[PDB]
Amino acid sequence: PTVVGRIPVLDVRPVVQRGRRPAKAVTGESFEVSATVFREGHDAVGANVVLRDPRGRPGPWTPMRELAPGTDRWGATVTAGETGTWSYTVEAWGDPVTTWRHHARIKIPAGLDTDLVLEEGARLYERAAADVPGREDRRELLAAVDALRDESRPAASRLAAALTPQVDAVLARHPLRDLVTSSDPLPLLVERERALYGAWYEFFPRSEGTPHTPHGTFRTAARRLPAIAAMGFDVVYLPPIHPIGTTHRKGRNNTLSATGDDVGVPWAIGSPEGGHDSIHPALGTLDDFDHFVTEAGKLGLEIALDFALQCSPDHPWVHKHPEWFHHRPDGTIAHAENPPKKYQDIYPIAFDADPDGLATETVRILRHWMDHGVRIFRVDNPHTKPVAFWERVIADINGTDPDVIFLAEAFTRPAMMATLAQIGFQQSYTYFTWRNTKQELTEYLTELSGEAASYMRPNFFANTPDILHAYLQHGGRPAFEVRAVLAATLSPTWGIYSGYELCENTPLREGSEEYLDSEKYQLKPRDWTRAAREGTTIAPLVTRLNTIRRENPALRQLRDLHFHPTDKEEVIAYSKRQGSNTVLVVVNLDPRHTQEATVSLDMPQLGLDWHESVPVRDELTGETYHWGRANYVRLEPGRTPAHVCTVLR
Amino acid sequence: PTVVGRIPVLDVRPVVQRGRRPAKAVTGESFEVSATVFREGHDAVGANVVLRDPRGRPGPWTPMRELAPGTDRWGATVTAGETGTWSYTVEAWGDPVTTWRHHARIKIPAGLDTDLVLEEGARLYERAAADVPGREDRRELLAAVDALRDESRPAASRLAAALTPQVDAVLARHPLRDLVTSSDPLPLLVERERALYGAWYEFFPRSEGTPHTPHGTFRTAARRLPAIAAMGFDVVYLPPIHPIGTTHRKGRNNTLSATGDDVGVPWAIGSPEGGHDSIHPALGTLDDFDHFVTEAGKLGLEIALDFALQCSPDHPWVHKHPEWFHHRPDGTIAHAENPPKKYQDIYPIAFDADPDGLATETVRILRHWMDHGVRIFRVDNPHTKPVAFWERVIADINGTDPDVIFLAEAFTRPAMMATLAQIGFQQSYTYFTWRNTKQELTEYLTELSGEAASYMRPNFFANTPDILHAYLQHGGRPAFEVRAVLAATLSPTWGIYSGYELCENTPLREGSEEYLDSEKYQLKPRDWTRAAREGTTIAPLVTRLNTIRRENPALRQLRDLHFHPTDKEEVIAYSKRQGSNTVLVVVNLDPRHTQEATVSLDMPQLGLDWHESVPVRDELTGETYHWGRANYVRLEPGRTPAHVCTVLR
Numbered sequence A, B: 001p002t003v004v005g006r007i008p009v010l011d012v013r014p015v016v017q018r019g020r021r022p023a024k025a026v027t028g029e030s031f032e033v034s035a036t037v038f039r040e041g042h043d044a045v046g047a048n049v050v051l052r053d054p055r056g057r058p059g060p061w062t063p064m065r066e067l068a069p070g071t072d073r074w075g076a077t078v079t080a081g082e083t084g085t086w087s088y089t090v091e092a093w094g095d096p097v098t099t100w101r102h103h104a105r106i107k108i109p110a111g112l113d114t115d116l117v118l119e120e121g122a123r124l125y126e127r128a129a130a131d132v133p134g135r136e137d138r139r140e141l142l143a144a145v146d147a148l149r150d151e152s153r154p155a156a157s158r159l160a161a162a163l164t165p166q167v168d169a170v171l172a173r174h175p176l177r178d179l180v181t182s183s184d185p186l187p188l189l190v191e192r193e194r195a196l197y198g199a200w201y202e203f204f205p206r207s208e209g210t211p212h213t214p215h216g217t218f219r220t221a222a223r224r225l226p227a228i229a230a231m232g233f234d235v236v237y238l239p240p241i242h243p244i245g246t247t248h249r250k251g252r253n254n255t256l257s258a259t260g261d262d263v264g265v266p267w268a269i270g271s272p273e274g275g276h277d278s279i280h281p282a283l284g285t286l287d288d289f290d291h292f293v294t295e296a297g298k299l300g301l302e303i304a305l306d307f308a309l310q311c312s313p314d315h316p317w318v319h320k321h322p323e324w325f326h327h328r329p330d331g332t333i334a335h336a337e338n339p340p341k342k343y344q345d346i347y348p349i350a351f352d353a354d355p356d357g358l359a360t361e362t363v364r365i366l367r368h369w370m371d372h373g374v375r376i377f378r379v380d381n382p383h384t385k386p387v388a389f390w391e392r393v394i395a396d397i398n399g400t401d402p403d404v405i406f407l408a409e410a411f412t413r414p415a416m417m418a419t420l421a422q423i424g425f426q427q428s429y430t431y432f433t434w435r436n437t438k439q440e441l442t443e444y445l446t447e448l449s450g451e452a453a454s455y456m457r458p459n460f461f462a463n464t465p466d467i468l469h470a471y472l473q474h475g476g477r478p479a480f481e482v483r484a485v486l487a488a489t490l491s492p493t494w495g496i497y498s499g500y501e502l503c504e505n506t507p508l509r510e511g512s513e514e515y516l517d518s519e520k521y522q523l524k525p526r527d528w529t530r531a532a533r534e535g536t537t538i539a540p541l542v543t544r545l546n547t548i549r550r551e552n553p554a555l556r557q558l559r560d561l562h563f564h565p566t567d568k569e570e571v572i573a574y575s576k577r578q579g580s581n582t583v584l585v586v587v588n589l590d591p592r593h594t595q596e597a598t599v600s601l602d603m604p605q606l607g608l609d610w611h612e613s614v615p616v617r618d619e620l621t622g623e624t625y626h627w628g629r630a631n632y633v634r635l636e637p638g639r640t641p642a643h644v645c646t647v648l649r
């Protein structure tokens, strides 16, 4: 048995881990299946993609084409349907009809062996007809066979009868395929739309309190949901909602020692009041949590809970499961670190003494929150827990509940980030916040929208509680505006952490990416009504960005993205497409100075000719322009961060 | 069961066809095995390559290192021994000692938890000792354990006892490896030296005749072997040695109709006198062929026969096995074509009616020539016969006779050329003759010496009977000289077709790559004695090039090759290394004008510092120079094509 088949079909992509893990898609998403296909000799080959659904049912006829001449690299676009585990195969075959046609077009006007050539064509078309299941189409090919064989007609007329568009049509859907050879099947995991597309908002329920009771409850926090739904968010991400330890608890601004009223850091999970399956008593009860989830659902919001597999020193696990921790020779457990950062309030888990116990307990915890309507988990720092552990835990949850989405908060080196996605994480955080220049954004989004998109789905948080970038610190509100536009239009999933609207940008100290007076360490009441009234919020821009996304399918996918050149370093331009929808975005990356630029569009990449000039509407303002090959733009920070334009007909 | 192991080890290279075919090497050849290796958390990893021989016996301890910081890409050099099918595995592991050392070096001078830290180190070294098989080395580690634990000594002194070079040495050979995780094994086919390294000469025995008998015999042709051995060739490649058809036989200069004395084209195989298992009666008998092989062997020459799986219309197969040919409707067999070229004297084989019959007969033919001492086959135009057919035929021959080498003469698109090598061809012809500028040579040799070298071994024929390049046509003898130097020093296998020495360069017509009066169509007597006497041959340069190769191991491998910049487009410079041997070549690609250039050497790539200046001998002239960072060279066509320098100590 030979590794290569009769008609070579090699290096089918996408492929993840040499076929040991699936390529990814979501319902409705298109991507390209490709292969290297060729044969011996000089005759033509053809190829097609057979996509099989979870019950092994084949998809539609999907013929491939050569992507660039002489490369023998073939491709076709496939579209994922129903969720589940699919497979795809490339079928390669000799294409004797294409070959015969080419020779016949030369030899017949030249008078060379014409009867022999036409009889050869008749024989191919007879064979074509044999594999055609419909009676009417079979008659069309047999009438072509008869015409080809009618020696009473000129040679040119006999040939023309085999080249009619109706004969073409039949052969396009039912070609004659010699020596069909298929690749071994490759696996495709198709997941729900929210895995790829969604707008996220992170906030701390405890901060949304009242004058009488400053520590918010689930009931007070639910009153913030409508303002979040109105900005057009889909997912609400909550920091840990569990009891918080007292031993080594941190104070305000990450001081070592908490005073008596200090609330501590939610990620320092557990006290005698309960662990990862409990509610912080100040937030209320499980029934209050159910009320919160219900009110979320009614406004079109899903809840994403933080899952941080670690413990405060007061978590029950510390005494009940000591082997879940690494102990030094004096019996102490060293607190967690991501140096030079220290987390004195937190003990990390050791996994090598009782891997089974940890997996069992982890999936029980997740299912408990799942039973209370949580179908999305934002997994804290997963790169400090074993990769195979996440692989197991994710396979177990999605095995019974394939709708559950896991987001990996792994800000680390590329290999690890890539592997976590590859072993099951539906979504990943990214380097976005550290990509601010044109060159950085262009290079990074070319990476994420290319081959990486077969295994990673990016979630572009413009900020997090741990990341207030220098760009926002120095640029003020115009920088917040720019970064919202970029995040919302470049990834089908994006997010902000509360206060981003208010352009909160005071760092702990120069050169830091921590916030001063971080919410991680204190209640952070914000006067939302006042901020709305005084117009010192960019909620309206955020709202419009999410509406634009909801109205334009091109913004709800990742893979189709093209950068168009401008003549100013500070002005970036790009387009995204889905079917007839084309969105074209131009952003001034300078938050302090007005920039003017000539944007030169790659017209064929928009589906247009060079001379063509086609109308656009800037959805940020309602204003209409006519744009083609070369366009003047003028963007003033504070008044116009960018144009976000849709193409109309 | 999880796809990723405890310590991730991913994307092991080399890999061919995702592990379905082996990577290649020859006895004595080094190459790099690499992998992506990392772990969770911030502690160090280590890795090593376990090479297993054909009986499953592990090779030596082969620790890998990170190739560039922060990439998590690790590598080590391995060296192939005995021929056969090997395997390689990468083992990844936590490296707790490296981690502990790093922390201990900081914390001990700082006075932080010193007793605890030193006790932790003692415990690692005790564990280290447990897996150490030698008593003396185990004592060295246990003395380090005791020193670490001696609370009567300063903390700095207790630590220094664990960092002694003798403790280092023990741990370098027997490190403490946590959580060892291996990759699945990948296959490696190791073949004999001649698969990679060898100088080849092609000639037509029939042309080396006498005055009485112009058509040479094996006996007259044997008298040419000494002149070939003296030029330092290892392999003699003969065009087909079988009877030649009469029907549609070609005349001189590829005319359609042969006249009565015309000898026809050897590749038009077969007549009633015999087929592929017979000798042309004008060449003599099988016993004469055995004499020829014996005389070859005595001079250090192996014979490579042409194997062209095709037939003249007079080959016995045409009537005895009609299903081995594709017939048109009137019963005729269309002659072979590689358009716009036509081979009216030749019928191609069809493979789809009796694939088994063709494989059986093909291997019988090969074994017959093998029984007569032919262990190398130059396979004619293999890309017009199915890829899986060669896969089968090669697996069958090498299954009993792994020393047999197949050379694929496939001048076609990259996918096919690559696949043929990948499915078993030991050697391939290449694009060399169409790479003549500096940029072309540099780009092409970077491709062949890189990843392609894991599956392809190039054979650089500077010319063939079908390829007289324009560069030789226009450049005359200085161009022949340049191309000999380039071919001989850039690939460990190279070749010429007879008459290249004589600088034969008259084309059929302008714009053609055929020779005028091609040997394919006629006897081509050459007066070798006269050419030697009159000095109108470049045999002496060829001889010296082969001697240089025989004396410098760096020229007998492929993978180590580096191009150094010069300041003239026409002057190329490069170096190759094997252990202590370094060869440095500078060539003037201009055959009409003297070129002067400053060659700027990449010194660290030579194993040297920038300021260093090290002596070289130009092996073409015996002359000695001192070369470093920046060197004046002056190359005059006719007198000095190039410098071929060896580094001495």
Ligand SMILES: OC[C@H]1O[C@@H]2O[C@H]3[C@H](O)[C@@H](O)[C@@H](O[C@H]4[C@H](O)[C@@H](O)[C@@H](O[C@H]5[C@H](O)[C@@H](O)[C@@H](O[C@H]6[C@H](O)[C@@H](O)[C@@H](O[C@H]7[C@H](O)[C@@H](O)[C@@H](O[C@H]1[C@H](O)[C@H]2O)O[C@@H]7CO)O[C@@H]6CO)O[C@@H]5CO)O[C@@H]4CO)O[C@@H]3CO
Pocket (backbone or CB within 6 Å): A069, A070, A071, B411, B412, B413, B414, B431, B434, B435
């Ligand atoms: O026939 C049209 C073609 O002819 C002329 O080019 C010469 C050339 O100057 C010579 O060097 C020589 O070519 C060698 C190559 O040097 C050698 O590499 C090999 O070439 C292979 C390529 O390396 C490989 O990529 C592939 O070729 C593909 C290619 O990627 C495609 O882009 C496409 O090529 C077309 C070109 O795009 C187009 O510009 C034009 O080219 C002219 C050329 O300008 C002219 O000066 O047409 C071509 C072909 O239709 O398709 C090819 C697949 O054919 O594989 C090839 C090997 O086939 O081999 C050749 C000679 O053996 O000779 C050519 C012509 O003899």
Ligand SMILES: OC[C@H]1O[C@@H]2O[C@H]3[C@H](O)[C@@H](O)[C@@H](O[C@H]4[C@H](O)[C@@H](O)[C@@H](O[C@H]5[C@H](O)[C@@H](O)[C@@H](O[C@H]6[C@H](O)[C@@H](O)[C@@H](O[C@H]7[C@H](O)[C@@H](O)[C@@H](O[C@H]1[C@H](O)[C@H]2O)O[C@@H]7CO)O[C@@H]6CO)O[C@@H]5CO)O[C@@H]4CO)O[C@@H]3CO
Pocket (backbone or CB within 6 Å): A411, A412, A413, A414, A431, A434, A435, B069, B070, B071
């Ligand atoms: O600490 C030394 C380092 O610190 C300063 O850089 C800033 C930088 O200006 C910010 O952008 C930000 O970095 C982000 C990155 O933008 C983001 O991409 C991600 O970075 C990852 C890389 O993308 C990825 O390649 C890998 O990094 C490797 C890297 O390939 C190696 O070459 C090596 O990096 C070293 C550099 O070679 C060396 O120049 C120096 O770098 C300075 C930097 O000049 C300074 O201005 O030291 C580094 C590291 O020792 O090793 C790394 C592996 O760490 O993976 C990284 C992710 O770790 O993430 C960061 C922030 O999350 O912040 C940095 C510092 O915070």
